[PDB]
């Protein structure tokens, strides 16, 4: 029991999670648009793809288009990326023009890593997008035994 | 004649000892405390919402 | 060893003659579910409670060492916590530690880690609005005469007239739980105040109980946290009654049994003196002992 | 270093661990063995405090906050001060006990004399350690205190010159003097433990359990045997005082002597003189 | 404090009104 | 830090409007 | 040499390719205390409205280039609120506009960082508290004062919002041009020119930095001094030490032959090591 | 533990008192005093860091304005900061002359094996001990500094599980880490100070001036007749040193090492320049 307790106080607790839930709608949103907002803090892109564009060679169905929530950042520096600027010449900064080849495909250019995924999930028909990030256990959960 | 498994035997030892201890003091100390609960008072709280709202 | 009972003094402890003391506690027992035997807080009682604070005594009291997340598990949920606390609005000067995570430059909605701040800046503030008097912070209200039954008899207990020398100027009314039996508060619970929730009557001892139990339950080491812990003891306190035998067996049994000796001396006439007598001995204290002692 | 003619027991770790291994204790009673259970509680402070400074930031208008929210976000650190203070009280309790133990045994004889010295070195500065403890409380005891120390302190230079700043500065909780307070309080309480072992090596040479001569030659080892019966009446001595405390101070009380420390330094400006009143072991 | 592994360590998300 | 030796020790006389 | 961190903006120019001119960084120079006045007379009219210092007091300045009163009535001119204070311990109970006083923090105007991005479209304007630590030194806030003459070259495409620098990072800044001919008026009557403003700013905020500034010549002083204390007793070190040695080297050594029939049984069966224990049982059996 | 033989010698103090009392040197000269070089510099940073350690608040969102406040209230405080860092430098520079000099000598021998593990442990607490004060600095190079040293530990236990968190918390410098880290800083310096003590008593067995033997028998006495020389040499060295860096130093100075050293942990958080920069002793 004491070994327990000093073991504890020094690797911490966490009470509770932190509430980040949030809801936007995409069902006005036209095909093959980009819209930026900004989640937790961070700037994010949401982007209603086409079935011509998808073809073209994680993925959300909503409807019969394809919607990509991704979090608007350059990985190698700060940055907000210009989206539809050249397509596959698009998502680009400033500071390099190493693309992010309108996708998750990462190796473009100078520019290391790709834009990090977001966790969602789009749960009406293909309108309400729900976001919150990812739950991981934090036990002893319990916090009251009465 | 195998130490570590007399260790291991000690190690039982401390567990039952630890249990005996541990498991009919929070018994009963919940079975005590049954009707002060949050549940106890969501469901009273949602009773009344109900009985206000179809007044 | 023996203190009087007639001084005002509580079991030997002076310094508190100047007001009414043992009422909750030694003169009548006022029963709290959460400070009997294998009890806890009424978790409707911490949430009523908690309304009440909100709804009236939020309104000059502040809990500055404490945030609005303590309610969590055992009054409120996540939700309707959130939404209540967004009720009222912080402001930057508020903050007691404005940091850089603070970047906000006018009033928001406060969220359920913001600590429990009253609407005044500023302690000086509270003064100034309250006529000279500082509405005390509510963080260590636990030592007061009676803590929980303080806060209850504070509550209640307007209903007395001040005897002859005594003057009760404007802006003070008479209360013989404050100190000096003066207080700068004006009676605030009236019958009806504040709509429950749950739809529990709303009185005058009601509010008070909950309010108290509210602010009790806030409080560390004796709130919130008590109960699981007296409960610890229990445990713990039968595991040494239930060790207690097989200590004595190892201990005072093993000892008995080394003590069971058998002993037996002999004429030893063989001509051989004690020359080990005589010329032995040892002493590890010798190099202290040596040119100071015996000489 | 003509004068000193050496170490009673050189302290090697190799040396210790052997002396440990082959010491041998004479049978005796549970009147013998306060010495055995101020150590424990001695490891058990170091323990907690370390555990507790992990978490205290030196700054006088941060220290109440913290410790509130400290309480609140870990299992531990609460259980932790509420060990650190009871193992005050049973430092002082025992350290008492033992002291009165001597008083009656008469242990004032020249081969008495090496353990009474130490003894009382241990116990000024146990006093000092305490006293660096309470100050660093930061409240109204705390600053009541911390005067009493600064103005007894200046009594010796008569009240000229500032003598004591280097230490207490102006003779308030500022950070300055809280950050020294407090690294000394750690410092010092392990020196306090160094000594206090320093001391309990010491004793082997006059070991008695009563003051009479009982004459057996046989004793038992202190590893399993002796150490074994030391930890009962260790948690036999707990359980006496869990009993005495459970029914001799019921929750909530009247009136209580800890009513003074509700204020606090900074935020509250203004003192209730009337209620002054320490922790028991400064009443006297 | 808010400076704490459990509390928002050390800002990188600050409470703020953005917009 | 406006709570030191040097300067404010205690806030004993607070700045108030 | 070797300073790959930088390549695009222009750095050497202070230091290194040409040699301006501070009165504090000469061999044996201190700071100007009318150029120092003047500096914070320009940064109260004009730069104290965007940048403000968080870590630096206005009691600065005090016992040289400004008396107490004089400066407790110019810096009173100021406003200060509580949400501008990063913490307060108790000790500010103000809970509305005051005057600042001396003792008092170099706020911006702004109650925080943000604010102050969103008041200047999104760029922060930088607190000069450790801006010791930009290319050039003290030479940094004059050559960004005086770098809006050049032109940018074919595509460089400067923004909208943004302006042309070639010492800042990347050569595009969002600081307009703040310095012009007669915007401030000195007290003492100096002319007030760009350059002039520029020099006497870049003086004050350079005194206020920590390990440059009010603190280094009296450090470089010292410096000297034990640099002379330490040649001076060169030669009496050497003398002691050195001397002494030979001193005691001046041996004579006779060695003579025994015949007496004596064996050497002292360097047969003796010797004693400190590490026997270390050697025995383990080494040479 | 019957597979240990014993120390060397005792850690008592009038065994050490005599020890140093009665110690002889043989003749030597500038490239033999790297050692005593070290301690003098390691007491010198004992004192300064302890002046250090009595201002500085372990909150990370004050420690930069502390600094800059003590600095213009004070009068040493920037110095003992500046010898606490020039010592730092003169720490690595003269343990590295120290390790080079007894790599050249060939000191790889069995009847000096025990001088070098000493020496080796003491080098590597060094290193310790200056990662946890680089760390304190908390700026963006402290920032780096803990991610790469959190990021080892990460992949030394396989990236599975959070073992780095009872020291590095969450990978980053929050209160909870800079509190440990100071006073790990602090302990492990002093403890430095001691394995230092235990080397300088492990070197008397061979000690020569040069590879090559010189069969003088004759030697001074070490209290004033080589202390004296140490220090004179010290002084050699300082000078030397100040010469050097006046001469390669110059102020104001563009485009230097330093310029990573801005940004804050807490006050910058929308700037981090790629291009980083550590100090000249970890740079291999
Ligand atoms: C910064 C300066 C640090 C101190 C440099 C130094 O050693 O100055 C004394 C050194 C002379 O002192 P010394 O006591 O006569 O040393 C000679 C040995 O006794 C001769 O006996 P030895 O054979 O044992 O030593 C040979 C060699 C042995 O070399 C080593 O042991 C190398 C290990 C590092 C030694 C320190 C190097 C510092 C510079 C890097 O030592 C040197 O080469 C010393 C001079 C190194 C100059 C670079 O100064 C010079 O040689 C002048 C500078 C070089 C010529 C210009
Ligand atoms: C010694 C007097 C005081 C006794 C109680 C002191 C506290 C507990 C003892 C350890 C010292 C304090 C360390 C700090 C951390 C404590 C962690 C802890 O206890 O967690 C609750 C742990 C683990 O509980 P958990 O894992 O369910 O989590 C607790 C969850 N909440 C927060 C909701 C309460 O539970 C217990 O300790 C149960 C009680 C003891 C069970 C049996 C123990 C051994 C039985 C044989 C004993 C023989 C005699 C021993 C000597 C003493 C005799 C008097
Ligand atoms: C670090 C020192 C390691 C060391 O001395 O190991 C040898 C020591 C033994 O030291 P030793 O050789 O002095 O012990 C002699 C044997 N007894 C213990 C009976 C006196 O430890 C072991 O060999 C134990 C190995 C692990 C066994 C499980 C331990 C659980 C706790
Ligand atoms: C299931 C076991 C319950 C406990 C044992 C039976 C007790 C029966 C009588 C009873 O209810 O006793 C209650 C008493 C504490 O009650 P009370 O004193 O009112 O409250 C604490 C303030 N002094 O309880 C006590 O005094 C006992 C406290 C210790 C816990 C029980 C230990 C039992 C032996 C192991
Ligand atoms: C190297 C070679 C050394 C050789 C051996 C010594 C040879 C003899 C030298 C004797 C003469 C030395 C005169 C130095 C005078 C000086 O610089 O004083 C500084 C000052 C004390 O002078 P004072 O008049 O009291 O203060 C004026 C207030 N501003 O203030 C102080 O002294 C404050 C000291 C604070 C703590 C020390 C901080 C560093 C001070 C020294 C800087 C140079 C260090 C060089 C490396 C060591
Ligand atoms: C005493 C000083 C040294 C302490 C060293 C750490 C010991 C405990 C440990 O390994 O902790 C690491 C980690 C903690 O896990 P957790 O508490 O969930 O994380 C903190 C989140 N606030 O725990 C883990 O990653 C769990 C790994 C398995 C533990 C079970 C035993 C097998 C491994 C040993
Ligand atoms: C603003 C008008 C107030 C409201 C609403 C409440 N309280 Fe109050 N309280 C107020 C003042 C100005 C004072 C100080 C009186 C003095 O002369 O010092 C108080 C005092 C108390 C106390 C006494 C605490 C003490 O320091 O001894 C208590 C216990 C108290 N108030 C409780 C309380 C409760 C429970 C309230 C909600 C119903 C409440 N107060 C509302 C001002 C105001
Ligand atoms: C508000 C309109 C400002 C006034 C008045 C002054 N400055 Fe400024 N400055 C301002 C901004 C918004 C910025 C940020 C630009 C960016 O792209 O980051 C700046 C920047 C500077 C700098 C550069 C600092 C750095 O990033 O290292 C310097 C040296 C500077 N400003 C100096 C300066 C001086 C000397 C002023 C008084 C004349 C002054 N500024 C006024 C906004 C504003
Ligand atoms: C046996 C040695 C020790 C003694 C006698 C001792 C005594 C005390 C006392 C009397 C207090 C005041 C508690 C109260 O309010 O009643 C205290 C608090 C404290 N002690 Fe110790 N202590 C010891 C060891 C240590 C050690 C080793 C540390 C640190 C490693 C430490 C750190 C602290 C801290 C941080 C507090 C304040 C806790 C708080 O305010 O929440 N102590 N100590
Ligand atoms: C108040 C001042 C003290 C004095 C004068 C004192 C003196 C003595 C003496 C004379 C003995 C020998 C008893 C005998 O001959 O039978 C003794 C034993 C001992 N003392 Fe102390 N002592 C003091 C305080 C302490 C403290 C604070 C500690 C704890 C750190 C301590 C630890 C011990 C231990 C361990 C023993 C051996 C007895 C045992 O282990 O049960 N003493 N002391
Ligand atoms: C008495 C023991 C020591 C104490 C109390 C101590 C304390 C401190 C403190 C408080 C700082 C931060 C100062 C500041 O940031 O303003 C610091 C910095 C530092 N310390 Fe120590 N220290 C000690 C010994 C040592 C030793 C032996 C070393 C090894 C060389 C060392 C290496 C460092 C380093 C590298 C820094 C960072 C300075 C920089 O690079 O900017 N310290 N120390
Ligand atoms: C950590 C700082 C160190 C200190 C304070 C230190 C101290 C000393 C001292 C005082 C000497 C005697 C000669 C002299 O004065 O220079 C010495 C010699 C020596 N040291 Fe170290 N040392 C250190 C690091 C090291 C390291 C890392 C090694 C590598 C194994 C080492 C190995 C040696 C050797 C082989 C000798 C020669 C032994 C002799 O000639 O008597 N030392 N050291
Ligand atoms: S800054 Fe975005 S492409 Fe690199």
């Known amino acids: 029991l004491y070994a327990m307790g000093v073991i504890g106080r020094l690797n911490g607790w966490k009470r509770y999670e932190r509430d980040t839930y949030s809801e936007v709608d995409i069902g006005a949103l036209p095909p093959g648009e980009v819209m930026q907002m900004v989640w937790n803090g961070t700037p994010i892109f949401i982007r209603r793809l086409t079935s011509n564009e998808v073809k073209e060679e994680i993925l959300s169905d909503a409807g019969n288009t394809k919607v990509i929530v991704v979090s608007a950042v350059c990985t190698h520096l700060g940055c907000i990326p210009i989206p539809y600027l050249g397509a596959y010449k698009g998502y680009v900064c400033i500071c390099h023009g190493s693309v992010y080849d309108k996708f998750a495909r990462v190796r473009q250019g100078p520019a290391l890593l790709n834009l990090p995924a977001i966790n969602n999930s789009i749960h009406d028909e293909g309108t309400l997008v729900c976001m919150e990030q990812l739950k991981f256990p934090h036990e002893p959960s319990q916090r009251f035994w009465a | ?55 | ?295 | 270093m003509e004068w000193n003619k050496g170490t009673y027991m050189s302290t090697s770790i190799k040396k210790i661990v052997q002396y440990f291994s082959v010491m041998t204790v004479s049978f005796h009673d549970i009147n013998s063995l306060f010495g055995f259970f101020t150590f424990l509680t001695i490891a058990s402070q170091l323990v907690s405090g370390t555990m507790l400074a992990f978490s205290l930031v030196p700054e006088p208008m941060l220290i109440p906050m913290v410790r509130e929210e400290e309480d609140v976000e870990d299992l531990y650190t609460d259980d932790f001060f509420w060990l650190h203070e009871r193992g005050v009280d049973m430092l002082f309790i025992f350290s008492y006990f033992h002291l009165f133990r001597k008083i009656y045994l008469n242990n004032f004889e020249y081969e008495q004399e090496a353990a009474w010295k130490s003894g009382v070195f241990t116990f000024l500065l146990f006093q000092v350690v305490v006293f660096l403890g309470l100050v660093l409380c930061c409240t109204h005891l705390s600053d009541i205190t911390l005067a009493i120390a600064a103005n007894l302190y200046d009594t010796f230079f008569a009240g000229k010159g500032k003598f004591y700043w280097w230490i207490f500065t102006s003779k308030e909780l500022n950070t300055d003097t809280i950050i020294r307070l407090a690294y000394l309080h750690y410092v010092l309480a392990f020196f306090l433990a160094y000594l206090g072992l320093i001391h309990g090596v010491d004793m082997h040479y006059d070991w008695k359990n009563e003051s009479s001569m009982d004459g057996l030659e046989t004793e038992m080892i202190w590893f399993d045997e002796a150490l074994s019966n030391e930890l009962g009446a260790m948690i036999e001595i707990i359980l006496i005082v869990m009993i005495v405390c459970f029914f001799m101070y019921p929750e909530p009380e009247a009136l209580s002597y800890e009513f003074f420390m509700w204020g606090d330094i900074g935020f509250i400006n203004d003192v209730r003189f009337l209620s002054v009143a320490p922790h028991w072991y400064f009443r006297p | 404090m808010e400076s704490r592994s459990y509390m928002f360590s050390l800002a990188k998300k600050r409470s703020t009104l953005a917009a | ?17």
Request: with cysteine.
């Open chain 2, 1 to 55: 004649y195998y130490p570590f498994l007399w260790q291991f035997f000690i190690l039982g030892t401390s567990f039952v000892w630890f249990h005996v201890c541990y498991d009919p003091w929070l018994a009963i100390y919940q079975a005590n405390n049954a009707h002060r609960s949050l549940e106890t008072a969501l469901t009273k709280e949602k009773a009344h919402k109900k009985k206000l709202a179809e007044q």
């Open chain 3, 1 to 295: 060893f023996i203190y009087r009972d007639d001084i005002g003094a509580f079991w030997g402890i002076k310094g508190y003659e100047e007001l009414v003391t043992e009422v909750g506690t030694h003169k009548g027992h006022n029963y709290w579910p959460q400070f009997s035997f294998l009890g806890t807080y009424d978790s409707g009682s911490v949430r009523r409670g908690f309304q009440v604070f909100a709804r009236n005594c939020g309104n000059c009291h502040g809990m500055i060492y404490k945030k609005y997340d303590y309610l969590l598990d055992k009054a409120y949920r996540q939700l309707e916590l959130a939404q209540m606390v967004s009720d009222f609005t912080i402001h930057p000067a508020h903050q007691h530690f404005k940091q850089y995570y603070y970047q906000e430059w006018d009033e928001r909605d406060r969220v359920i880690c913001d600590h429990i701040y009253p609407p005044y800046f500023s302690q000086d503030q509270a003064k100034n609005a309250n006529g000279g008097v500082w509405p005390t912070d509510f963080s260590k209200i636990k030592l007061r005469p009676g803590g929980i039954n303080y806060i209850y008899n504070i509550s209640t207990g307007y209903h007395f007239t001040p005897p002859f020398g005594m003057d009760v100027p404007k802006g003070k009314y008479f209360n013989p739980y404050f100190d000096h039996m003066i207080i700068g508060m004006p009676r605030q619970l009236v019958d009806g105040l504040v709509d429950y929730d749950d739809g529990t009557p709303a009185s005058t001892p009601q509010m008070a109980y909950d309010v108290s139990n509210f602010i009790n339950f806030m409080q560390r080491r004796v709130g919130y946290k008590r109960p699981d812990k007296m409960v610890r003891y229990y445990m713990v306190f039968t595991g040494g009654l239930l060790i207690l035998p097989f200590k004595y067996f190892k201990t005072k049994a093993y000892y008995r049994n080394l003590l069971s000796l058998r002993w037996e001396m002999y004429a030893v006439r063989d001509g051989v003196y004690y020359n080990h007598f005589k010329y032995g001995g040892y002493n590890s204290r010798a190099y202290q002992f040596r040119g100071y002692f015996w000489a």
């Open chain 6, 1 to 17: 830090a406006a709570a030191r030796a040097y300067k404010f020790a205690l806030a004993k006389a607070r700045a108030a409007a």
